[PDB]
Nucleic acid binder design. Structure first.
Lengths: 113, 81, 18, 150, 129
RNA sequence: GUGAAAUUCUUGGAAGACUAACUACUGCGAAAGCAUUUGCCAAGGACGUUUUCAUUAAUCAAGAACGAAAGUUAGGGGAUCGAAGAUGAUCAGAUACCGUCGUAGUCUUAACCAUAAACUAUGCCGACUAGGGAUCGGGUGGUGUUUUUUUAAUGACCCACUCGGCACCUUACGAGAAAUCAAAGUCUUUGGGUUCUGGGGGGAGUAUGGUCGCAAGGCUGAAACUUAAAGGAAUUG
């Protein structure tokens, strides 16, 4: 919560993704995402915003990875995936060729079934 | 400044301008001659293309549409003109 | 309980006049 | 700047100083005349012919080597269409935005842009009706246009 | 839009003579302007100048030596009729001794004293002093 | 519950809204205006262009469209605030600013209304005239860099430049009553083109007639009489 507030710096862009997904058995969960565009240092210009079709494709690749990891091998094993941020560094790997990021997290854990 | 010539502007400075705002205008875009050596028959290609001008006979590619200058598609060797 | 702001605030437009 | 919008931007071609050669260039007039005739048999608009003979073939400009431009050639070789190209694209955009309004009643901004397009239709079609490249009694209306343009 | 041209020519020339300049480049360069400049050069109020030839209109580059007070255009071209040169030179000349109200007759563009000497009349362009 | 008491409270998953932060002296849109994700639709600007056309243009009386909120009408929605009205005080009076309950409304589908500080309180187009650094979009050059994989490529960033913006900062040659203004400059040395409006203050946007609207309203719009002022810009107790 206050972690999220410490995340929020001005002059930069917020990227949130969200997806609803069932596990193997009848347990459905909506997972979130937070990711901030970081300054790729050697910057002169002060802000480092994104380019707003960047944000579309970044949200889509994040949601894609969120769909690929879940509905395979239930939330026990999916939590075992979520612990060492294999997912978040995969986000880093897939996103970094366009604009890298910072503060890459899924930010929440909650069920709805 | 305040006493000088525009009948003889200096070269790189007059090349520094936008193309329209030069002294007597004449553009900067170029023709050249792309070879993808599968065909030794040369294709004269403009600096920009808007369209995938391919090779002459073997149908593959020579260029992609860009915002700026056309992208020579890496099987390439060329004289300019 | 921070809202994603809605549900118009009491006091009116010109506010709490004192 | 910008008859129906707010910009002032400059963006254009620029014909060179030459009213003669290239002199890297060797070919004859008749060759690219034949190529124009060929692409007209394919059915392209003279902008697209100039584009394609620019990038694909080595032609610099039509009027330097061949003293009749592309639409002079299509008119001269009996392949000129009914309406010229720009007026055609305006009515094409018009019937597009009109159909977009025919399924979407809710967007008034699209209606504004449509009315600007119609104003350009009336001004440009009036220029064409002036110099008799339309028939005097040429009429525009959407009821006719739906079958007219396409 | 660019509704008049000699207007913008004289405007550029006055704004240059104001800010101390020595040369100008004006555009789009009509014949009428060339006549006007030759009229001024005949009295010497500008130095010399030079046409350049693009394939649209040409452009002009003028040397302006030291002596232009104001070179202005009257708009629109009013129909002077010989007895009205006394009117216009009363209004828009600094004195009775110098300055020239130049005017366009059937016999060409020329200043008012040449219209006294050749005894024609017509429309008016402007004024140089 | 407040400034304090008090009216007020004490065994007593649905609904509707809206997209906080990121939100900037930043972008877009003819304005009025617009911030979740994704989709599609139709556009639009700038840049590029050795593609096309050849005056097709600029401003627009008449005439139409659009047009914040609130108000009006027929459903619905009805989660919240809340003109009105009711308390309960305070104050001399207080019909209120303060609280409590709060109907219409607020939200939406189908139509009027066409109004605002619709304010930049600065018509629209055209050029010319001065320095400076930032910043948005785009494009060009580079023995710039990053990224690693094997160099690249890309993508980001750096650098030199160029257009098209929203801006800024200093000046002042100029302008102005001054405040201030890169236009409010290029105006007595008065003419680039063009639509609208004004002629002391009150009477009064009243009367009157016309006009749209169901109405509210808007639009259009005086005289008699009266008076010598009304108004915009700096200093010292």
């Amino acid at each position: 919560t206050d972690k999220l507030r410490s995340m929020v710096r001005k002059w930069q862009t917020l990227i949130e993704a969200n997806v609803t997904v069932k596990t193997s058995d009848d347990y459905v969960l909506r997972i979130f995402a937070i990711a901030f565009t970081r300054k790729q240092a050697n910057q002169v210009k002060r802000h480092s915003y994104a380019q707003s079709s960047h944000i579309r494709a970044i949200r889509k690749v994040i949601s894609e990875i969120l769909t690929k990891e879940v509905q395979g091998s239930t939330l026990a094993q999916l939590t075992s995936k979520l612990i060492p941020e294999v997912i978040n560094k995969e986000i880093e790997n897939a996103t970094k060729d366009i604009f890298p990021l910072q503060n890459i997290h899924v930010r929440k854990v909650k069920l709805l079934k | 400044v305040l006493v000088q010539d525009l009948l003889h502007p200096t070269a790189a400075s007059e090349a520094r301008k936008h193309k329209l705002k030069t002294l007597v205008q004449g553009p900067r875009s170029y023709f050249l001659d792309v070879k993808c050596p599968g065909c030794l028959n040369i294709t004269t290609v403009f600096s920009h293309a808007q369209t995938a001008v391919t090779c002459e006979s073997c149908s593959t590619i020579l260029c992609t549409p860009t915002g700026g200058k056309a992208k020579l598609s890496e099987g390439t060797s060329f004289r300019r003109k | 309980p921070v809202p994603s702001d809605s549900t118009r605030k009491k006091g009116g437009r010109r506010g709490r006049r004192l | 700047g910008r008859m129906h919008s707010a910009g002032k931007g400059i963006s254009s071609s620029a014909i060179p100083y030459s009213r003669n050669a290239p002199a890297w260039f060797k070919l004859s007039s008749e060759s690219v005349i034949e190529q124009i005739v060929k692409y007209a048999r394919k059915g392209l608009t003279p902008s697209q012919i100039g584009v394609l003979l620019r990038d694909a073939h080595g032609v610099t400009q039509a009027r330097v080597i061949t003293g009749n431009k592309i639409m002079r050639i299509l008119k001269s070789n009996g392949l000129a269409p009914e309406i010229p190209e720009d007026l055609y694209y305006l009515i094409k955009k018009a019937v597009s935005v009109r159909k977009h309004l025919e399924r979407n009643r809710k967007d008034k901004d699209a209606k504004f842009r449509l009315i600007l397009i119609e104003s350009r239709i009336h001004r440009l079609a009036r220029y064409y009706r002036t110099v008799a490249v339309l028939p005097p009694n040429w009429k525009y209306e959407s009821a006719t246009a739906s079958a007219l343009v396409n | 839009t660019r509704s008049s041209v000699l207007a913008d020519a004289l405007n550029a020339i006055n704004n240059a003579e104001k800010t101390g300049k020595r040369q100008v480049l004006i555009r789009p360069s009509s014949k009428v302007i060339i006549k006007f400049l030759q009229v001024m050069q005949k009295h010497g109020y500008i130095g010399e100048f030079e046409y350049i030839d693009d394939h649209r209109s040409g452009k002009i580059v003028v040397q302006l030596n030291g002596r232009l007070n104001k070179c202005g255009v009257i708009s629109p071209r009013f129909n002077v009729k010989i007895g009205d040169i006394e009117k216009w030179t009363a209004n828009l000349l600094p004195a009775r001794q110098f300055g020239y109200v130049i005017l366009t007759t059937s016999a060409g563009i020329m200043d008012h004293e040449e219209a006294r000497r050749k005894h024609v009349s017509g429309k008016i362009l402007g004024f140089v002093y």
